[PDB]
Design an enzyme around this catalytic site. Structure first.
Site, PDB file in Angstrom:
ATOM      1  N   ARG A 194       0.769  -1.247   0.000  1.00  0.00           N
ATOM      2  CA  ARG A 194       0.000   0.000   0.000  1.00  0.00           C
ATOM      3  C   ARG A 194       0.802   1.300   0.000  1.00  0.00           C
ATOM      4  NH1 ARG A 194      -4.952   2.972   0.160  1.00  0.00           N
ATOM      5  NH2 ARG A 194      -6.276   1.112   0.418  1.00  0.00           N
ATOM      6  N   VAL A 195       1.719   1.440   0.950  1.00  0.00           N
ATOM      7  CA  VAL A 195       2.538   2.635   1.052  1.00  0.00           C
ATOM      8  C   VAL A 195       3.366   2.880  -0.216  1.00  0.00           C
ATOM      9  CG1 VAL A 195       4.826   1.991   1.939  1.00  0.00           C
ATOM     10  CG2 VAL A 195       3.548   3.931   2.956  1.00  0.00           C
TER      11      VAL A 195
END
Ligand code: ATP
Ligand code: ADP
Ligand code: ADP
Ligand code: MG
Lengths: 501, 477, 477
Positions: free
Chosen positions: A364-365
């Protein structure tokens, strides 16, 4: 809070303003009388010298959640005020220890009288204090780091069915911090706060001791909310360890906190409320099931230099029931955390361990976590497998199709035997750069697999035996060199015919 | 010591409603968990206090029939939990959910009695030492291993394993083992409870004459209210304990269903003034299966090689009953009803039977590898059996057609019928502590030996029998 | 004006229970919806009145931590809903769920503040005029189109679209667009909320120096109680409004999840003395998603090209949460998790992504025909992919085998990766406002161009690339 001289307390209880005499009690929800000036959360004192926190201030009672089993708390017990919202102990002192889940030690190593407490009710900082998650955190689990890179100051949810590896991973991710907790670069360190919610106190002693074997326990704090502990302990515990690391996330230093079983806290949360008679919602969970696992994770945030540069990375562990990751609580928890490593029992035994379901998981990041190293190698790895879920589940019945297509499938089977990390030992990032990198740069490939594991094991001995330079280039430049690529190339190529006559 | 204040510890029953009897004390309010004594009785009616409702009134969970109870009957306050006679002077004998002798051979003359509600072993009481213990049962021993002070647990609905495997383990274990043995039957049949007694007589284990009894029988079952099925498993546990602690021995403990400690809540929660939950249950199931199960564990004074059994309501593992329990069993065995059809017995399934002692350091690198490989082949096997080929094998891909010979034979090798099933077909109760597990099974997966006419190797495990059966049922000309 | 009667508008907190604080006024009962002021505080604790319980006592829904609250604390009656500073003097800045400056740059000097509870646009305020607005995103633009004063809404569970597509649209939109922009993040991550800030700095949008800020940042998220996540989306809406009305401009409005306005009810209903409903919810979800969403609409004074996002609890569209909302979105996009596996991104699905502006008069006869034909072929495609042929394509019926080339390539052409996914593989952020959508895609369905080695046209949409990829990955000899 104080009393008088004339025997056991003398003067205190006499006023229902600062004290209160229990009205009812059962299933640890003492509906105390009196307690007028009680605050909406100031943990109180019973006659049997026991803690509890006033949770339901009401017109003619306070409804307190009793810490620890009933027996002694009984209709009439005098209740004392401890004017201080739910707070617990913290500091560097708690390093190298194991305590219950309210502060005090358990591992008979004596006292850890701390002098710097920390309330648990703290609000997450915000848009401004937080900056960007840079300066990753090396787990040592190849399959994880290279594939699913964890960044510092973020929440990485590790979900997995019963017996899937959720704790080995977290036990290797913590174990890896070994070298740094005595190395040079103080910023390249990590303190861990292992929390346990539910677990039998012997499973926890399997870890305390195990970690102690690698000396890991020397640079870690472990806390327990183990079954015996009344549901509230199993509830206050995560919010306790959160305040442990926050020392570090507010003091330059950083931390890796493992919330062991938020779902087990899920099972353990609905209790405290139902008994408080707070109208149940979905599958018993008290309505604020979100604010339960949001409010928390939202505390493991990245810290900007202007605010500290510190951090707190938090991987909440979650129980997968047969494979469903979208159940109420999991949705609740995957609708917050950034990055969810899925562990599938369904795979495991096949050799496919850690067993992470690309597609139903993400970092995600973004590429931010994966250093130039992985962005040079791993950049292909995970998404290579994403759509590959099709061709891997299609090649088993392929015929008159794209002849050469075989390549995209061949990059899977061979790679698999290397991507399956599994042992009580982490491989430093420059080692990850050694073996896995060789794969992305199709060199091993064609060779009949199986013996690949022999490589990922030997290659290392081979490295430290005659290739100590290469890794250092990572410690110099910080990426795979044009020169080093040539060299590693000259080493893996030899392995093609290393078992080839 | 059990003695009240200089004021009445007598309470007059104010409300009886099924398994719940509210009582009201005027000069001596009796604590949560205290075992109480109904006066005016024609027997023994202990009502365990449960809540402190106010208006100087407790709320007890009745230990036996509440029949004929009367609003006003005097309830006696003892001053301590239901405490059973714990000691050697209770082995061989049979005790009910209070310490009353149920096997009928009279008084249990004992030096003292332990409370059934005791603080569990703390964290610095624990012991990491996980020393192996062989059961000599394919899956149950090799696949998902056991261990000293470990925790067994079987998962099947109504009749697939559990009681049978508990008797099985009793065979391969209970009979030969140093130290003692205990069997707390919770909820389950009274029939089995009787036979088990008699079988324990016919085989010496329970000797009514000499004093050569290693087991103890604590019972609390079905024909009883929930307040007894709730604590029975506790007593059979208050029993294993004193043998380990105060008499430093490595006991074992058989609980015919430990989650019967939960049905008890499913029957007393809401009627205690609680708000329901998962399927109805209780805002407690957790701490329950918790607090109790956190007792049958080892320590720096002794070990308890316990054994339990957990039911599967509505055939749903998805029930927070077999589930919540998982996190306690140091060995898993979810027996499939969908397996029973296939005959595969025990019905231990190739996925949902984990362990916390299956590392190459204790179980083996070779063995754990073939186990992994057994399940590996078994997984794509579970898919292939339907996916791709669509039921009918043959098709193509001998790679998986290999699975149709390997995995299939594997399922068979693991389908150990054993002694306990002697009543259906008097079949070869296969077992044997590992011994010749080497070579035999290893062969299959690699391809060695594997090929003999499929079902020709069904009701037998040891590969030697493949050719030793080929004669029984042959094929060629 | 906010001023009470000639009697105390002060109430003494009589009961705090989590996110609910009952208050009791003796000489000035404060109306439903009134923002209240907790005295004795060490910060700002506004409790919004909610019910008028009687016994001269209201019942407020607390806007922030209720921590340390005390039974007796004075609550101040303001005389009006939670009113935020609305104006230009709040663009570029970041506001929390009350109008408190959260970006830390100090006071929000404003001429006035609008109430967050206002009568929505009436029926003769409305405007039929549905003027187009291009986003330059395959499915999201061509398939299920958008429109001025329209309503976007994306439907996926946890991580499949929503935030990403809201940033995507921010790219293709937010950056270049006349008038202003607003972003009310509800519930969702604080991380994204921070980056978004900084990204809005790095790209000018938010300029801390000059005064060249077109956006406004109203936030109320996760680390907060439900009473704030409930109204935050309201403020970020009380914001878009004043820009349209009193400052006649065509605003936009990004709500990172608008149904977070509902989770708030799932957390405050029953604890307000309500009887549950669908899954537990509230006897209000309807009027809720109603009353509020009936605000972000155009009028005879200005337009609001709003954009929202709606979560999919338990991956169940069957939840009255994404559902009840459907009837509000002037464009649909239910992103499939079952799609994510397939990579297809955005995960906009070929059936559940409707619209109220897809007629040949605005979107096109040719285009709407191929759209219909895309989904047509796609429907029998959804069946064929399994039904009849059974997974494995080939088989027979080139009519549908045509579908296996057409529909398949179609899915690809629509799987526009775009800029916002730059962090996973730095791939060609394909887009472009229609332009060469003609010829290219039309070809496929008719058969023109379609035939190139299936997956050879996967991670790219524009047909030109088929041959422009054939070189990348070739096949022949
Ligand atoms: N790296 C590994 N490779 C293969 N097997 C492993 C590895 N690490 C651990 N195992 C074993 O597999 C199981 C997984 O670890 P663990 O038991 O903690 O899983 P879990 O998902 O946390 O569940 P639980 O602790 O409730 O059993 C254990 O028996 C463990 O020792
Ligand atoms: N060892 C065994 N081998 C084959 N079938 C068995 C065995 N044990 C039980 N069964 C089958 O299961 C049925 C009942 O299950 P059982 O194991 O006896 O239930 P439980 O043990 O839960 O009381 C039997 O009557 C029989 O069909
Ligand atoms: N444009 C995109 N292209 C491909 N995958 C994407 C894209 N946006 C999101 N994803 C996938 O979805 C995961 C998270 O979903 P995301 O859209 O970011 O959730 P949400 O927007 O609801 O917060 C990512 O980490 C990634 O696998
Ligand atoms: Mg674990």
């Amino acid at each position: 809070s104080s009393i008088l001289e004339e025997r056991i307390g003398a003067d205190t209880s006499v006023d229902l303003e600062e004290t209160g005499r229990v009205l009812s009690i059962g299933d640890g929800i003492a509906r105390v009388h009196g307690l007028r000036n009680v605050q909406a959360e100031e943990m109180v004192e019973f006659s049997s010298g026991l803690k509890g926190m006033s949770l339901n201030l009401e017109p003619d009672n306070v409804g307190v959640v009793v810490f620890g089993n009933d027996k002694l708390i009984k209709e009439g017990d005098i209740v004392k005020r401890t004017g201080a919202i739910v707070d617990v102990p913290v500091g560097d002192e708690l390093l190298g220890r194991v305590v219950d889940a309210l502060g005090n030690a358990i591992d008979g190593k004596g006292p850890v009288g701390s002098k710097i407490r920390r309330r648990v009710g703290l609000k997450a900082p915000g848009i401004i204090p937080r900056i960007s998650v840079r300066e990753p955190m090396q787990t040592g689990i190849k399959a994880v780091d290279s594939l699913v890179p964890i960044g510092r100051g973020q929440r990485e949810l590790i979900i997995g069915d019963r017996q899937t590896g959720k704790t080995s991973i977290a036990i290797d991710t913590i174990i890896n911090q070994k070298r740094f907790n005595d190395g040079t670069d103080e910023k390249k360190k990590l303190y861990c706060i292992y929390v346990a919610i539910g677990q039998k106190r012997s499973t926890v002693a399997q870890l305390v001791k195990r970690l102690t074997d690698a000396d890991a326990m020397k640079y870690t704090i472990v806390v327990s909310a183990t079954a015996s502990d009344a549901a509230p302990l199993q509830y206050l515990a995560p919010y306790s360890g959160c305040s442990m690391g926050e020392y570090f996330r507010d003091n330059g230093k950083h931390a890796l906190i493992i919330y062991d079983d938020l779902s087990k806290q899920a099972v353990a949360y609905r209790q405290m409320s139902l008994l408080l008679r707070r109208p149940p919602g979905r599958e018993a969970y008290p309505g604020d099931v979100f604010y339960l696992h949001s409010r928390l994770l939202e505390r493991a945030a990245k810290m900007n230099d202007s605010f500290g540069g510190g951090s707190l990375t938090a991987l909440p562990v979650i129980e997968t029931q047969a494979g469903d990751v979208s159940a109420y609580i999991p949705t609740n928890v995957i609708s917050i955390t950034d990055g969810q490593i899925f562990l599938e029992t369904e795979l495991f035994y096949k050799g496919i361990r850690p067993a992470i379901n690309v597609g139903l998981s993400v970092s995600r990041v973004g590429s931010a976590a994966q250093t130039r190293a992985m962005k040079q190698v791993a950049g292909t790895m995970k998404l290579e497998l994403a759509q590959y879920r099709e061709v891997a589940a299609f090649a088993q019945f392929g015929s008159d199709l794209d002849a050469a297509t075989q390549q995209l499938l061949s990059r899977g089977v061979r790679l698999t035997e290397l991507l399956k990390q599994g042992q009580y030992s982490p491989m430093a990032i420059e080692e990850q750069v050694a073996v896995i990198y060789a794969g992305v740069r199709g060199y091993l490939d064609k060779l009949e697999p199986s013996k690949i594991t022999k490589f990922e094991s030997a290659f290392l001995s081979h490295v430290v035996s005659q290739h100590q330079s290469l890794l250092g280039n990572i410690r110099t430049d910080g990426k795979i060199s044009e020169q080093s690529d040539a060299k590693l190339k000259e080493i893996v190529t030899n392995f093609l015919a290393g078992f080839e006559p | 010591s059990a003695a009240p204040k200089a004021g009445t510890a007598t309470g007059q029953i104010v409300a009886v409603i099924g398994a719940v009897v509210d009582v009201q004390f005027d000069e001596g309010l009796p604590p949560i968990l205290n075992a109480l004594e109904v006066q005016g009785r024609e027997s023994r009616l202990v009502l365990e206090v449960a809540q402190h409702l106010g208006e100087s009134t407790v709320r007890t969970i009745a230990m036996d029939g509440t029949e004929g109870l009367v609003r006003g009957q005097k309830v006696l306050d003892s001053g301590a939990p239901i405490k059973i006679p714990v000691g050697p002077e209770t082995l061989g004998r049979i005790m009910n959910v209070i310490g009353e002798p149920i096997d009928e051979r009279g008084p249990i003359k004992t030096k003292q009695f332990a409370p059934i509600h005791a603080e569990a072993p703390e964290f610095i009481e624990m012991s990491v030492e996980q020393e192996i213990l062989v059961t000599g049962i394919k899956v149950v021993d090799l696949l998902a291993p056991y261990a000293k002070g470990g925790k067994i647990g079987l998962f099947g609905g109504a009749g697939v394993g559990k009681t049978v495997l508990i008797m099985e383990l009793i065979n391969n274990v209970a009979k030969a083992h140093g130290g003692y043995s205990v069997f707390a039957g919770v909820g389950e049949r009274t029939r089995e409870g009787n036979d088990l007694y008699h079988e324990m007589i016919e085989s010496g284990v329970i000797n009514l004459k000499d004093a050569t009894s290693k087991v103890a029988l604590v019972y609390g079952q079905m024909n009883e209210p929930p307040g007894a099925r709730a604590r029975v498993a506790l007593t059979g546990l208050t029993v294993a304990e004193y043998f380990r602690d105060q008499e430093g021995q490595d006991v074992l403990l058989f609980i015919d269903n430990i989650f019967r400690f939960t049905q008890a809540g499913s029957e007393v929660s809401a009627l205690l003034g609680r708000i329901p939950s998962a399927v109805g249950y209780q805002p407690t199931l957790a701490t329950d299966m918790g607090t109790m199960q956190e007792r049958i564990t080892t320590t720096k004074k002794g070990s308890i090689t316990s054994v339990q059994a957990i039911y599967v309501p509505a055939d749903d593992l998805t029930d927070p009953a077999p589930a919540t329990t998982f996190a306690h069993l140091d060995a898993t065995t979810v027996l499939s009803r969908a397996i029973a059809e296939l005959g595969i017995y025990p019905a231990v399934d190739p996925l949902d039977s984990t362990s916390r002692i299956m590392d190459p350091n204790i179980v083996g690198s070779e063995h754990y590898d073939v186990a992994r490989g057994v399940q590996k082949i078994l997984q794509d096997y579970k898919s292939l059996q339907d996916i791709i080929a669509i039921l009918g094998m043959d098709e193509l891909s001998e790679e998986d057609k290999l699975t149709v010979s390997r995995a299939r034979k594997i399922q068979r090798f693991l389908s150990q019928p054993f002694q306990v099933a002697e009543v259906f077909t008097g079949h070869m109760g296969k077992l044997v502590p590992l011994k010749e597990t080497i070579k035999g099974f290893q062969q299959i997966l690699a391809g060695d030996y594997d090929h003999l006419p499929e079902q020709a190797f069904y009701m037998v495990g040891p590969i030697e029998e493949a050719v030793a059966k080929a004669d029984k049922l042959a094929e060629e000309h």
